Amino acid sequence: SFSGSTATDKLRAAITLGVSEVAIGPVEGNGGRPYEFGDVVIPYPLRIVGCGSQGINVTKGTVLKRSAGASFMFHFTGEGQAQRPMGGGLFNINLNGDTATALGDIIKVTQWSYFKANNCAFQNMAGWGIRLKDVMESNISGNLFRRLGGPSGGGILFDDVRSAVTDNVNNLHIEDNTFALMSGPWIGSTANSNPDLIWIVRNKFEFDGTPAAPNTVDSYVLDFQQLSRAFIQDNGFTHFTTERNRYVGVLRVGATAVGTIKFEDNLLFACESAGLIAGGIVVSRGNVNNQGSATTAIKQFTNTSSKLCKLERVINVQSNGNVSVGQQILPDGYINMAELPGNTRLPSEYDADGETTSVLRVPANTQVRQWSVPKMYKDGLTVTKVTVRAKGAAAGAILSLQSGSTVLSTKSIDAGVWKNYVFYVKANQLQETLQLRNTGTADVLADGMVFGKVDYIDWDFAIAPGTLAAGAKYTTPNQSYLDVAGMRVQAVSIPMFDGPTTGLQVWVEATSANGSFVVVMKNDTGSELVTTVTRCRVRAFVSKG
Amino acid sequence: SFSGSTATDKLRAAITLGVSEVAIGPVEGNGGRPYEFGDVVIPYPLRIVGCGSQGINVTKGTVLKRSAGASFMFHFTGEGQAQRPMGGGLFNINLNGDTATALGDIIKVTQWSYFKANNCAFQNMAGWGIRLKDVMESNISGNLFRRLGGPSGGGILFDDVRSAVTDNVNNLHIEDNTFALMSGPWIGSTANSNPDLIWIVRNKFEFDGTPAAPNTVDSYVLDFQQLSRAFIQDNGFTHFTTERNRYVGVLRVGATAVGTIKFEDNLLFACESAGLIAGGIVVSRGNVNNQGSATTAIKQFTNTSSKLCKLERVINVQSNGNVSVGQQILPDGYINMAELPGNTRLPSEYDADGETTSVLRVPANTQVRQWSVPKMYKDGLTVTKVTVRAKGAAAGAILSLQSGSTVLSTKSIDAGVWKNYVFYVKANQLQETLQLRNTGTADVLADGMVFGKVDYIDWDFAIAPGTLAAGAKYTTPNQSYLDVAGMRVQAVSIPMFDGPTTGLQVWVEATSANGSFVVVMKNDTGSELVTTVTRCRVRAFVSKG
Amino acid sequence: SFSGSTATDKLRAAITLGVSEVAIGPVEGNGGRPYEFGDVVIPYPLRIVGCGSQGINVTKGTVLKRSAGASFMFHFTGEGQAQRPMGGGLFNINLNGDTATALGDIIKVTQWSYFKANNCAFQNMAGWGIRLKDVMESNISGNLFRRLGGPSGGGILFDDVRSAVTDNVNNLHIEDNTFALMSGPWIGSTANSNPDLIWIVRNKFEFDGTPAAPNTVDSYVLDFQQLSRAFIQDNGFTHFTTERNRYVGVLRVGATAVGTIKFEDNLLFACESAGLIAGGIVVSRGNVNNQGSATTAIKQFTNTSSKLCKLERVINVQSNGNVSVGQQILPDGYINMAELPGNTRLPSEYDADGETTSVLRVPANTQVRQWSVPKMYKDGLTVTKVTVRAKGAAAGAILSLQSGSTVLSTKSIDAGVWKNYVFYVKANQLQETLQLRNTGTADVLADGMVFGKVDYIDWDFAIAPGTLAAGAKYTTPNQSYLDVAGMRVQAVSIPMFDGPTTGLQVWVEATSANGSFVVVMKNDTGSELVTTVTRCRVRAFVSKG
């Protein structure tokens, strides 16, 4: 119902006139054939209604082809405009490329808000199905993406920012879609996209086959060089393997991503790897892979991020229901240091031998982390213990456990190896907070720790029994409950020593009701005994009172 | 295509005629200007289709203004009707108020079911965008809400019930929307709303700026005086602070709310507080705040509810990726008493010094809580231990640990202070269930507990060694494994005493294979020894067999 | 606008002509009455737009009745076709049966893809509302289902596969719907459906009442004989009880289901039982039932599946906010064996006395499970311990703990009873992995285990003190720290024995700094002492160094 030689011209009349909605009909009213468009520019929120369907087939409703050498089909842009376009989009339309190897894009959207593409299809072209730049508050749900992309293509791209880092893709919904038989990133972002608040939820993703342009490089279904707040949840992912068009992993996150990215509750089938996280804050939990026909269990994320990641296992069940990869078996009470709070920015780095492969690097004269003491432990009658797994970068790293600026205990850290460092807190020393600091001259790598109440404390002390005549005895200095535990001692172990105590009868005498004691050592040999021991030790048990 | 002076009159003709769908056109067919409506009443399910968009702008599709002094624009009601209206609503329409300070509402819906408002906009007015009363099975997804509300306004209100408490808002979806630049409650409910089964999922909420009518009182984005079953999940919330139009918190729940409310997996940016929960059952987990430009870490929920809340921390990450607020460090094995089952309704109350600030008040002669014993522990060879954190309201509270009506152990509770109370269960005493009861005369406040297996038990017993001649010895009464642990004893600690044992040689003699024993005390001084001790104690170790 | 006697004929003209969209009008243009259809066949993706609503009422928009003896109303099929139909469906239509007891179906869909049914209603008939066979990539959201089904009926059925097991229902969305007042399965699947990637999310389900055809057998709201990947999340379920039309449970999963099924974050009101799981991998968490007016707390799932299930409690809160059923109290560190990985398929089976009622059956000469040792424990200075709960099927089952093919410890398993079996790993024995194997001649049932670090090890050794003269002494053989713990010993308990040690003074002499020791036993009686003991034992304490 508009004037011009071709559909490209017919439609441009509507735009110049500036009509709000432009209904388009099926393949019947153009006799079996799809209206062809090319390089059309739309500078206002125009709706393009259809009478077509989400689907592959081109024989039964609105269908659109790109023109033989066109760069794009539509480009919904607000560039140079004085009022940002806000609305419209594609509804009920089977969009298509000119050839199966055509490059460029199908839809561009630039300098836009509240774009929507419902119940459509994007297919057959080796470039990008949808290219977004400075597109906000939009929605792309209920579409098909098929035979898109390749070395210079993909499904949906979040492109560079337009001018400021804040001129980005944000508040975008990608829901209820189906992606199959594609190449490149199926959803992706550039090194300068800065995207934020993205929902990728309740989609199907499945290999199906290699399209016209196979992948040339190792590829990822979801490939985001940058990504801030994102929900990637309740999706299916099916048959992504290296041999099936080089999908080496499901998700890759780039080194300058911020997060928080939530990769949760996805149900995978015969996928080779969760993928690679090189940056950002990423939370992964509730993911399960049925290995199906795959020859190997799914691989877990490779993590090299400089920031906290919380990556629970993707469970691997074989097709017969047998678990072959379960939850990670953590040390009881283990906490990775990056989960704790602290006053200094400390980048995480990779160490193959860390419990999670992710460890903090803490310079000289710097806090590691600080935490609050549980209220139940703060009763003046609780002994606590810190075990921290650490590795010196070089000689001379020292870890101190402190209550604010008060120093409770220090340990020298061995260079080049992971070792466990134990610090006790006496009951009379525990306050509101504890911290670990590097008080040495070299970097220390800090893996994680175990903090909690203990029902004992180990105690070692100086003795000097010397040379004892037949039947003579030596009594050790008094071991006060104050110095031993900082609170009442319930009882002690048999004492042991820094050497043999051959021919000494040993017992323990209480010196108060509160479990203070001496050790008595008596020459039971019947002739002169030259002793050699200089240290005595017990395990001291604590209860309450 | 209907007869009358103004649009208000034109449209009423359609309603009197009772047409099912009333299509409305863009700003082109009314020459740049939006059809104005006022006080229209709709008593049947009428659809009002449009050719407009979710968006701010008013220059490119269906657009509607309210008339200069109208109370409402539309009021979809079934009041006085004999068949409840079931269907219709607003589609593809940019709805608007007459002025930026106009009060009243834009849409009222009353005595209704299956109302829907898709792909529209609600904006520029200081009253309520949508006011719902007795509205069931409805859906409001894919809309914009902007420059709404103020002291007497807001986005969506769930109003009082119509007649019975069951004449309420229920089974309502609020999804895929965008809320920005508003005042009052952005979604809210009255003290008599009684709402149930509400989805507020995958929305954006962002400050953006102060509208025409700033807030006059401390405000909350989500403000629900009443709320039963609710999903508040997978939302963005951005820049809600006191200085930015007095958003002191994200969520407030009123004292008479029932729950269960799920506040989960929301991604916050530069928000000041999660808010305030004064009632209901509320579950919060998986929430994370990037502090961004905010000068302070987000504050956690303030909880004063009389009912169980499970509030995991909102994690605070700084813009550089550093955790400054992590997961709460709980005592190992801690369980808040309100998570346990029990036969008596026990209101929770606030105590700043409780592990979660929430504690039970248990009157005289009342059960605290009862739990099932794990099957693995019920082998006749397991010693268990209960530590419970408690505070007397006044003198004379007593806690008893029981197996049904059998009393295992009692402790007097100190008034006015939090203390840890330890109860052992001997291996021959453990059955199907345990309970803690107040068997005293005053209220006890119960914080939480730690229940589990132990590998030792502490034992204290009467002795009377008296006055021993040179070389004489005293042997304690037999300490049976039955009385000590209720099962085989593996071994014991060195014995300790209620006073000094100067000059006594002490050893232990087994009296059976099953670890029953006596303690032997021999005068090693060579003259008369007057002993002073009256009690002996050990830690007894248990294994199996 | 098509030629024929009745609507059945009028519509068939459109299909023969092969029109893409067939708009249908309201009850006004057919004078109060609904267009009646019967046995219509649709072999191409045809859209059927309406001007009606999701709703019960039939007086205000597009409404359709089935013809008096019709088997179906529509049957969207691609049977015999050469291009699979891909698209179209029902939009804005109040579909209905001829009578309230009519059997058969309302909609059939067969050999189809990308079917959609938005904003409609399915009601009043005793057969199936929607019957799906080989239907892929479809969507059924925003509908009502009411007064459907009975002994031969229900809401949505996933029928048998068409030819191959891969010709099934898959990638189907069921969202935003309302189900009420129905009989049979409200959503269901056959013994040969093989469905995969099904979303049942954010629906209301509520009893409301018994329809025309009550249930004849014990019924389930969700009844899936087969089901692979499924999201069943964020739903309401209300008043499903035996007395309210025999809804004995919410979910039943059949014996040949594969999973993974996620039953998570559903909010129940006055429901009697979560239901019955007889197969598949099923994950249940975050579900809560407000008991409301029900006389009993909800019952938990009954589990008889041959595969791993992770079933966290459905929490039961009474209407006053009191927990009456809380989280399951598990033994600390408990892991069900089916959560661990292993090299052999081991079917799970029911045992009422297992911690989760689900236990593995492990034949003779077979691995139970194998796990990785935490990195923090692999420092050559950590003693670990395995406690496993086991029951012999018959005499002669044996459990071995191994490091690969090296055997660390073996225990004989008692027939017919559950007992706890303890295995220590010395510090010098711990490598990369541990495994438990059945090395006996009978089946063993394996419930679960507790694995972790310990700070002690128990040690028992041969002694032969014989007959001692007055004042004579016996010294035990040396107890090396290598044999005791495999690492330095900190200290030991008082020694105990396999019998009485009447008249023996006992002490301990260190034989090295590393906690190796002998026990000294001296005749303190003053005449000949015939000893009877042959074994000595200690608890040995370990720290580090």
Which residues in chain B are closer than 8 Å to A199, comparing Cβ atoms? Answer: 202, 234
Torsion region of A343: left, alpha or beta (phi above 0 gives left; psi -120 to 50 gives alpha): alpha
Token pair listed for A24? 């388009």
Sign of CA dihedral A55, A60, A62, A63: positive
SS3 B8: helix
Which residues in chain B are closer than 8 Å to C234, comparing Cβ atoms? Answer: 199, 201, 231, 233
What is the DSSP code string of B157-199? EE---SSSTTSS-EEEEEES-EEES--S-SEEE-TT---EEEE
Cα distance between residue B472 and residue A454, in whole Å: 40
Does the CB of C334 have a partner CB in chain A at under 8 Å? no
Look at residues B334, B381, B338, B378 and name the one whose alpha carbon lies nearest to residue B362.
Answer: B338
Does the CB of B342 have a partner CB in chain C at under 8 Å? yes
Cα distance between residue B165 and residue B376, in whole Å: 47
Which residues in chain C are closer than 8 Å to B517, comparing Cβ atoms? Answer: 496
Last residue of a domain, one of B276, B303, B325: B325
Token pair listed for C406? 């090296």
The verdict on residue A69 lying in a domain is yes
- Stretch 148-177 of chain C: residues touching chain A, C-beta under 8 Å: 171, 173, 175
What is the DSSP code string of C229-250? SEEEES-EEE---STTTSEEEE
* Pairing status of strand A94-96 against strand A63-66: parallel
Distance from CA of B180 to the nearest CA of C (A): 25
Could you tell me if C283 and C261 are in contact, meaning their C-beta atoms sit under 8 angstroms apart?
A: yes
Q: Which long-range contacts (CB under 8 A, 24 or more apart) does A462-467 make?
A: A462/A534, A462/A535, A463/A497, A463/A519, A463/A521, A463/A533, A463/A534, A463/A535, A463/A536, A464/A534, A465/A504, A465/A521, A465/A531, A465/A533, A466/A531, A467/A528, A467/A529, A467/A530, A467/A531
Any chains having at least 3 CB pairs less than 8 A from chain A are B, C
Distance from CA of A279 to the nearest CA of B (A): 10
Q: Are residues C113 and C229 in the same domain?
A: yes
The verdict on residue C11 lying in a domain is no
Distance from CA of C182 to the nearest CA of A (A): 28
Last residue of a domain, one of C454, C485, C508: C454
Token pair listed for A470? 């037949």
Token pair listed for B503? 């000059």
Q: Are residues B163 and B261 in the same domain?
A: yes
Residue B441 CB contacts under 8 Å (≥ 6 apart), including other chains:
B364, B396, B397
Nearest residue of chain C to residue B450 (CA atoms)? C332
Q: Which residue has the tokens 């101190």?
A: A400
The verdict on residue B364 lying in a domain is yes
Token pair listed for A147? 């035979």
Could you tell me if B90 and B62 are in contact, meaning their C-beta atoms sit under 8 angstroms apart?
A: no
SS3 A11: helix
Q: Are residues A222 and A351 in the same domain?
A: no
Q: Return the bridge partners of A479, or none.
A: A517
Could you tell me if A490 and A517 are in contact, meaning their C-beta atoms sit under 8 angstroms apart?
A: no
Interface with A, mutate which of B24, B33, B35, B53 (most A CBs under 10 A)? B53
SS3 B468: strand
Cα distance between residue C441 and residue C394, in whole Å: 9
Q: Return the bridge partners of B411, or none.
A: B399
Does the CB of A473 have a partner CB in chain C at under 8 Å? no
Last residue of a domain, one of B299, B325, B351: B325
Residue A507 CB contacts under 8 Å (≥ 6 apart), including other chains:
A519, A520, B505, B506, B507, C507
Cα distance between residue A135 and residue A111, in whole Å: 6
Q: Which residue has the tokens 């009474």?
A: C318
Residue C405 CB contacts under 8 Å (≥ 6 apart), including other chains:
none
The verdict on residue C463 lying in a domain is yes
Residue C163 CB contacts under 8 Å (≥ 6 apart), including other chains:
none
Residue B45 CB contacts under 8 Å (≥ 6 apart), including other chains:
B85, B86, B87, B88, B114, C53, C55, C57, C60, C61
Which residues in chain A are closer than 8 Å to C452, comparing Cβ atoms? Answer: 331-332
Q: Are residues A276 and A408 in the same domain?
A: no
Q: Which residue has the tokens 């410890």?
A: C409
Longest dimension (CA), chain C: 126
Q: Are residues C448 and C461 in the same domain?
A: no
Token pair listed for C484? 């005791």
SS3 A74: strand
∠ Cα A301 A307 A310 (to 5°): 50
Q: Are residues A211 and A74 in the same domain?
A: yes
Could you tell me if A404 and A436 are in contact, meaning their C-beta atoms sit under 8 angstroms apart?
A: no
Cα distance between residue B278 and residue B225, in whole Å: 9
Which residues in chain C are closer than 8 Å to A234, comparing Cβ atoms? Answer: 199, 201, 231, 233
SS3 A337: helix
Backbone angles phi, psi at A12, to 5 degrees: -60, -30
CA-CA distances (angstroms) from residue A160 to A163, A188, A194, A282, B104?
9, 11, 8, 22, 44
Does the CB of B290 have a partner CB in chain A at under 8 Å? yes
Does the CB of B461 have a partner CB in chain A at under 8 Å? no
- Stretch 259-278 of chain B: residues touching chain A, C-beta under 8 Å: 265, 267, 269
Contact B258 C290 (CB under 8 A): yes
Of A20, A116, A264, nearest to B26 by CB-CB distance is A20
Which residues in chain C are closer than 8 Å to A324, comparing Cβ atoms? Answer: 341-342
Residue contacts between A and C (CB atoms, under 8 Å): 223
Could you tell me if C244 and C181 are in contact, meaning their C-beta atoms sit under 8 angstroms apart?
A: no
Which contiguous run of DSSP H or E holds residue B448?
strand B444-454
Buried-state track A410-440, b at ≥16 Cβ within 10 A, e below 16: ebebeeeebebbbbbbbbebbeeebbbbbeb
Look at residues A472, A477, A445 and name the one whose alpha carbon lies nearest to residue A527.
Answer: A472
Q: Are residues C379 and C404 in the same domain?
A: yes
Q: Number of C-alpha atoms within 13 angstroms, CB side, residue C434?
A: 25
Cα distance between residue B541 and residue B529, in whole Å: 32
Any chains having at least 3 CB pairs less than 8 A from chain B are A, C
Could you tell me if A294 and A277 are in contact, meaning their C-beta atoms sit under 8 angstroms apart?
A: no
- Distance, first Cα to last Cα, chain C: 94
- Stretch 401-460 of chain B: residues touching chain A, C-beta under 8 Å: 418-420, 422, 447-448, 450, 456, 458
Q: Are residues A212 and A126 in the same domain?
A: yes
Token pair listed for C394? 């018959």
Q: Are residues A299 and A374 in the same domain?
A: no
Does the CB of A77 have a partner CB in chain C at under 8 Å? no
Does the CB of B331 have a partner CB in chain C at under 8 Å? no
Which residues in chain B are closer than 8 Å to C327, comparing Cβ atoms? Answer: 339
Residue A450 CB contacts under 8 Å (≥ 6 apart), including other chains:
A331, A332, A333, A334, A335, A386, A387, C376
Could you tell me if B368 and B437 are in contact, meaning their C-beta atoms sit under 8 angstroms apart?
A: yes
Residue contacts between A and B (CB atoms, under 8 Å): 223
Q: Which residues of B are catalytic?
A: 137, 196, 206, 208
Strand segments, DSSP code E, in B482-523 are: 491-492, 496-497, 504-510, 517-523
Neighbours of B232 (CB within 10 A): 25
Interface with C, mutate which of A177, A206, A358, A494 (most C CBs under 10 A)? A494
Q: What is the four-CA torsion angle of B107, B113, B119, B120, rounded to 10 degrees? A: 0
Cα distance between residue A336 and residue C410, in whole Å: 35
Nearest residue of chain B to residue A88 (CA atoms)? B53
∠ Cα C341 C347 C351 (to 5°): 110
Could you tell me if B500 and A516 are in contact, meaning their C-beta atoms sit under 8 angstroms apart?
A: no
Cα distance between residue B145 and residue B55, in whole Å: 9
Buried-state track A158-190, b at ≥16 Cβ within 10 A, e below 16: bbbbeeeeeebbbbbbbbbbbbbbbbbbbbbbb
Q: Which residues of A are catalytic?
A: 137, 196, 206, 208
Sign of CA dihedral B25, B31, B32, B33: negative
Cα distance between residue A542 and residue B13, in whole Å: 87
What is the DSSP code string of A463-511? ----EE-TT-EEEPPPB-HHHHTSS---EEPBPEESS--TTEEEEEEES
Look at residues C437, C348, C353, C358 and name the one whose alpha carbon lies nearest to residue C397.
Answer: C437
Look at residues A147, A142, A136 and name the one whose alpha carbon lies nearest to residue A207.
Answer: A147
Cα distance between residue A120 and residue A114, in whole Å: 17
Cα distance between residue A488 and residue A513, in whole Å: 9
Nearest residue of chain C to residue A319 (CA atoms)? C258
Does the CB of B498 have a partner CB in chain A at under 8 Å? yes
The verdict on residue B300 lying in a domain is yes
The verdict on residue B330 lying in a domain is no
Cα distance between residue C336 and residue C352, in whole Å: 15
Longest dimension (CA), chain B: 126
The yes-or-no answer on residue C21 being catalytic is no
Expressed in Å, this structure's resolution amounts to 1.8
Q: Are residues C316 and C339 in the same domain?
A: no
Does the CB of B330 have a partner CB in chain A at under 8 Å? yes
Is the bond leading into C511 cis (omega within 30 degrees of zero)? no
Q: What is the four-CA torsion angle of A256, A261, A264, A269, rounded to 10 degrees? A: -40
Q: Are residues A209 and A155 in the same domain?
A: yes
CATH value at residue C245? 2.160.20
Q: What is the four-CA torsion angle of B275, B277, B283, B287, rounded to 10 degrees? A: 0
The verdict on residue C211 lying in a domain is yes
Any chains having at least 3 CB pairs less than 8 A from chain C are A, B
Does the CB of C329 have a partner CB in chain B at under 8 Å? yes
Backbone angles phi, psi at C304, to 5 degrees: -125, 15
Distance from CA of A7 to the nearest CA of B (A): 22
Q: What's the structural domain count of chain A?
A: 3
Look at residues B408, B366, B359, B365 and name the one whose alpha carbon lies nearest to residue B388.
Answer: B359
The verdict on residue A13 lying in a domain is no
Which residues in chain C are closer than 8 Å to B493, comparing Cβ atoms? Answer: 493-494
Q: Are residues B146 and B270 in the same domain?
A: yes
Cα distance between residue C416 and residue B256, in whole Å: 53
Cα distance between residue C89 and residue C44, in whole Å: 10
Which residues in chain A are closer than 8 Å to B499, comparing Cβ atoms? Answer: 510, 512-513
For residue A488, the enclosing domain spans 457-541
Could you tell me if A96 and A63 are in contact, meaning their C-beta atoms sit under 8 angstroms apart?
A: yes
CA-CA distances (angstroms) from residue B25 to A90, A261, B92, B94?
19, 42, 10, 12
SS3 A436: strand
CA-CA distances (angstroms) from residue C401 to C382, C387, C407, C451, C515?
17, 11, 6, 12, 27
